[model samples]
Target: QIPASEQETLVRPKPELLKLLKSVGAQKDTYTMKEVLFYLGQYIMTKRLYDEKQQHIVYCSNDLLGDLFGVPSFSVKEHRKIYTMIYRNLVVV
Candidate 1:
C-alpha cells in the first residue's frame, strides 16, 4: 500500500477539461482514478495521443492541442491555464 506522504499528487481532473475531451473522444464512464492521476506532465509538455485504457486522457485530436492552448505556442502564459486547472491541488514530482 502507498502512504499519503508517499502518494504522488499527480494529475487531477478538471470538469471543464473533461467536457472538452468528451467532445474530442474521452469516454465518460471509462478511466479510473489511479490511471488519470499522472497526466499533468504530458498534457502540457508536448503533443500526445490521449489513450483511454491508459487513463491518461479522454481526447485525441491535433486541433484539440492547438485549441486547448488557444494558439500555436505553449509558452503562452494563457495556454498553461488548462494544464493548471487540471493540475490544481496536484503536487508534481
Candidate 2:
C-alpha cells in the first residue's frame, strides 16, 4: 500500500501538458499515478540540473528527462547524485 504522503505526491498534469504529451505520442494508458509523481519530481530536478549548467548529465527512464531533453534516455540516479554533489560543493563556495 502506498503511504498517504506518497499518494499525494503524484501530480495531475495540466490539461495543456497532457495534451502536449499526447500530441508527442506519449503512451496514455501506460502513465500511472506514481509515474506522474516521478515525472513531476524529475521535472523539478531537471530545472536544478539546468541551473547548475550540468545539462550533459543523463537520467534514467524516458518519462521526465526524456521529455525535458528530447532524448530517449538519461541517468536519473546520476542526475540526482550530481545535484547532491553540487549542493555539497556549494557549501564551501
Candidate 3:
C-alpha cells in the first residue's frame, strides 16, 4: 500500500542519470540503495554482460553502463562497491 504522505525517505538519483536508472527497473523518482543495486543487477543480467573468458567478470557493454561504472570491465566481487559508489553519487544528500 502507498503511504499517505508519500514522503521522500528514499534517495533520488542525479538528473542526468535518472532515466538510465529507471530504464533498468528503478521505476521511481526516489529509491533505496538496495533497490538501485538490485535494478542494476537486472540490467546486467538482461544485457548478458558477464565476461566470456572469466565468467565471474562483467563488462560495461554500453554507453549507459560504461558511463555508470567508469570502467570497461570488473569482477562480480567489485559489483557492490561499484553500485555503492553510484548510489553515493546519485544520492541527493
Candidate 4:
C-alpha cells in the first residue's frame, strides 16, 4: 500500500453511484477518490464498454454512465474530468 502523504478524505457514494458500483461487486460504504476511479474503471472494463478498434474511446452503450452523464461516448483520456464530475457529487464522510 502507498503511504499517505496528505489528508485523504473518504466519501459516501450516492444512490446512483452505489448502484453502479454494486453491479461490479464493490460493497464498500465509503471510498477515496482514487478507489472510486478504480472501481469505475473496473465497471467499464467488466462491461467491455470500449470500442475494440479504438481502445481510447469508451462507448457507454446507453448504460448508466451514458444515461446519467449524457455522455454516450468519451475518450479515456477524459477520465480525470469524468472522475471529478462524479466525485463532486459524492457526500464527504
Candidate 5:
C-alpha cells in the first residue's frame, strides 16, 4: 500500500503535473551535502518530468514542494524550505 499521507496525493490524480511526478516515483527534503544529495539524486531528480506536449523536459523547483520519497519519513527544505526539480525521458518530435 502507498503511504497514507500519499493517498490524498494519488487518489484523484486531478492535478496534471503532480500526478505525472508521482508516476515517476517522484518525491523530499533536508540539509547537508550528504543529506541534500540523497534528496536531490534519489528523491527530487530520481524521475523524469513530462511537459504538456508529453515531452521530457526539465521542471521547475517550486512545483515539487512537499513531495515525499515513497514515504512520509523524509522532508524537503533548504535554508528554510526546499522543493524539487522535475523532468522525464522524451523524444524530440
Candidate 6:
C-alpha cells in the first residue's frame, strides 16, 4: 500500500493527468527527471479547469515543451545538462 505522504504528493489539481499517469502504470518513485520537468512546464503554462463531467483538467502542450527542452531531437549530452540544471534549480526552490 502507498503511504499517506506519498499519496498526498500524487494528488494533483488535474485529476485527468493523475489518472493518465496512473493508467500508464507510473509510480511516484519511478518518475524521471524529464517527466518532472515536463509536468512542471505544463503547470507553468497551462490554464486549468473542470470539464463538463466535473473532472479536473489542465490544457498543456507537452510536445511544445519537449521541443523547447530539445528532448529526443537533441543530443543526449545536451539533454543531460538540461536535466541537471533543472534538478539543481528545483533543489534550491
TM-score of every candidate: 0.28, 0.29, 0.71, 0.79, 0.22, 0.25
Evaluate all candidate structures by whole-model CA lDDT and list the values in order.
0.42, 0.43, 0.67, 0.76, 0.32, 0.38
Please provide, for model 3 over 1-93, each residue's C-alpha lDDT reduced to its tens digit, 9 standing for 90 to 100. Answer: 223332234667787567767777666887765566677778778887887788878878565776766778777776446755475457654
Going through the candidates in the order shown, the clash numbers are 1, 7, 0, 0, 10, 0
Q: List the residue pairs that clash in candidate 2.
A: 58-75, 59-74, 59-75, 59-76, 60-74, 60-75, 60-76
| Candidate 4 TM-score over all chains jointly | 0.79
| Residues 1-93 of candidate 2: C-alpha lDDT, one tens digit per residue | 445554444333555445534544455533444554454455546454333455545443444444434554444455444333222211110
Residue 9's lDDT within candidate 6 is: 33
Instruction: Choose 1 or 5, whichever is better by lDDT.
Output: 1
Best by TM-score: 4
Residue pairs with backbone atoms closer than 3 Å in model 6 (clashes): none
Better of 1 and 2 by lDDT: 2
lDDT of 5 by residue, 16-92 (tens): 43344344554521122233333344433544332345343334444453242222223232212222222121111
Error of 1 at 6 (Å): 11
Task: State the RMSD for candidate 6.
Answer: 13.5
lDDT of 4 by residue, 1-93 (tens): 333531256878888888888888887888886777788889889898989999988898568877655667888887555755676457888
**Candidate 1 per-residue C-alpha lDDT over 1-93 given as tens digits, one digit per residue, 9 for 90 to 100:** 334543344433456555544544456533443434333334433445444354434343455555444444332233234445334423333
Q: Which residue segments of model 1 deviate by more than 4 Å?
A: 1-12, 29-72, 75-85, 89-93
Candidate 5: residue 56 Cα off by (Å): 11
- Runs in model 4 with CA error above 4 Å? 1-8
Candidate 5, pairs of clashing residues: 28-76, 29-75, 29-76, 48-87, 48-88, 49-87, 49-88, 77-82, 78-81, 78-82
* lDDT, candidate 6, 1-50, per-residue tens: 32344323322223444444444445553344445545554443343322
By TM-score rank, best first, the candidates go 4, 3, 2, 1, 6, 5
